[PDB]
């Protein structure tokens, strides 16, 4: 059994001196007893596969990038969140009536979960006026005002979270103004998150669950205390 396997793998074991000595000694003992497109190591072809992450749609969110400005996190085949980097704001008040939204209980629970994860993942968020929201009728509209060192700014923390959440295709909109350490700066004044219906938007990057799953561990890791009894 092992003799055949050794016979198959002959070309790769000549260079060893011990193998040559063993072969020569075996031959001598037998004789004396009779007297009385990418190929590696010559045999390994380099092959590839690409995973179709879309098939995970029923059990986990999938994020993808359409272009610099538009990105999506889809939940199933019916709903999702459109995230837009933009200079055009759609909310011009300072309210975010989260408690009333919860009391009314009209929103999609999965989408509210994703909003909560995003917001809880922002590091060092400390300017509540920078976040405005509209939840009337169960819709979800969230507007982060990125206007203004760049490291200690709401814009940087929001953009770090956005980069992770829409990982893959986020970078094209990001780090135009290269900052100190890991800090991010862009030319956009607002990040807007609104619900949307399902459509194939993934022109720039393949849909993927990686960003969301990774962000799950970031929740609450870098939130500031705002009262003594949380």
């Amino acid at each position, epitope marked *: 059994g092992q003799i055949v396997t050794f016979f198959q793998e002959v070309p790769h074991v000549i260079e060893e001196v011990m193998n040559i000595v063993l072969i020569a000694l075996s031959v001598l003992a037998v004789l004396k007893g009779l007297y009385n497109t990418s190929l590696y190591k010559g045999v390994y072809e380099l092959q590839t596969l690409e995973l179709n992450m879309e098939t995970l749609n029923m059990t986990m969110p999938l994020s993808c990038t359409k272009n610099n400005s538009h990105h999506y996190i889809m939940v199933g085949n019916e709903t999702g969140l459109e995230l837009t*980097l933009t200079n*055009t704001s*759609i909310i011009n008040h300072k309210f975010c009536n989260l408690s009333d939204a919860h009391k009314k209980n009209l929103y999609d629970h999965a989408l509210m979960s994703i909003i909560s994860t995003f917001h809880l993942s922002i590091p060092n968020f400390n300017q509540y006026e920078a976040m405005s929201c*509209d939840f009337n009728g169960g819709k979800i509209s969230v507007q982060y005002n990125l206007s203004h060192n760049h490291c200690g700014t709401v814009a940087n923390g929001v953009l770090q979270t956005f980069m992770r959440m829409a990982w893959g295709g986020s970078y094209i909109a990001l780090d135009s103004g290269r900052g100190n350490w890991d800090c991010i700066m862009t*030319s956009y004044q607002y990040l807007i998150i609104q619900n949307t219906t399902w459509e194939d938007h993934c022109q720039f990057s393949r849909p993927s669950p990686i960003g969301y799953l990774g962000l799950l561990s970031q929740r609450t890791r870098d939130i500031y205390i705002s009262r003594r009894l949380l």
Partner: antibody, heavy 124, light 106 residues
Framework: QVQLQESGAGLLKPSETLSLSCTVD????????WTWIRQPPGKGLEWIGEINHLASTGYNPSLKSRVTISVDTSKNQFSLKLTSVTAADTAVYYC??????????????????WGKGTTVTVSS | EIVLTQSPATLSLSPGERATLSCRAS??????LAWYQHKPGQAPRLLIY???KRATGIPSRFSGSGSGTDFSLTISSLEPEDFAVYYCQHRSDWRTTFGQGTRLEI
């Protein structure tokens, strides 16, 4: 094909309140800034204000205290209220559909669909 | 707040002549200006937007250019129906402002 139909009385006396309404038929109501503009006689165009489908509004400062703009998404209309109108408020009033593009530079904004316009005069 | 000053106050030109109108902003623009044509008895009509893009139904003789604080509208060979009052308009976030207007007459 989009039409904006304006309704509202144009014959007023001073200290009354002007009420104008504009109904949109054609294309979506969201993603636009529904806008009120006016031209006083012998003057140029003047932005009164704007509102979007989330009821967020922007007003001209010189009129902020007196101007209110509202929407009704059920019948795709938006309304302008001007309180305590004086002789300086005589003008032609237009409603318009505004679109703002801020996703890439150069950003742009325009008013592409306009209503007919309503003359409003205040006198004794 | 950004304000727009138009130049000149009025223009006197013949049909077939080249018309050039300027709009100067008090600071670098939040977004590129747009240009409207207005005649008595009707609503203003969007001519140009993004400082250089023709709107629907606008003849190719209408062109625009500019950036920063300087913008211009050009009518290469002006037709008799091009005589009207022209406005530049700008929008910063939730604040729209108009130029004072330029009168183009024969």
């Amino acid at each position: 094909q989009v039409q904006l139909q304006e309704s509202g009385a144009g014959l007023l006396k001073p200290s009354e309140t002007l009420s104008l309404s504009c109904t949109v038929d054609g294309e979506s109501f969201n993603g636009f800034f529904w806008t009120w503009i006016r031209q006083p006689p012998g003057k140029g165009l003047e932005w009164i204000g704007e509102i979007n489908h989330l009821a967020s509004t922007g007003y001209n400062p010189s009129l902020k205290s007196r101007v209110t703009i509202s929407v009704d998404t059920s019948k795709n209309q938006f309304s302008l209220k001007l309180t305590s109108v004086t002789a300086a408020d005589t003008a032609v009033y237009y409603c318009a559909r505004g679109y703002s593009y801020g996703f890439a530079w150069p950003n742009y904004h325009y008013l592409d669909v306009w209503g007919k316009g309503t003359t409003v005069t205040v006198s004794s | 707040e950004i304000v727009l000053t138009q130049s000149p106050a009025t223009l006197s030109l013949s049909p077939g002549e080249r018309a050039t109108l300027s709009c100067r902003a008090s600071q670098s623009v939040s977004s590129y200006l747009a240009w409207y044509q207005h005649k008595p008895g009707q609503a203003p009509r969007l001519l140009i937007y993004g400082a250089s893009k023709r709107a629907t139904g606008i003849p190719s003789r209408f062109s625009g250019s500019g950036s920063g604080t300087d913008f211009s509208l050009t009518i290469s060979s002006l037709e008799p129906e091009d005589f009207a009052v022209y406005y530049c308009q700008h929008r910063s976030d939730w604040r729209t402002t108009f130029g004072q207007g330029t009168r183009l007459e024969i």
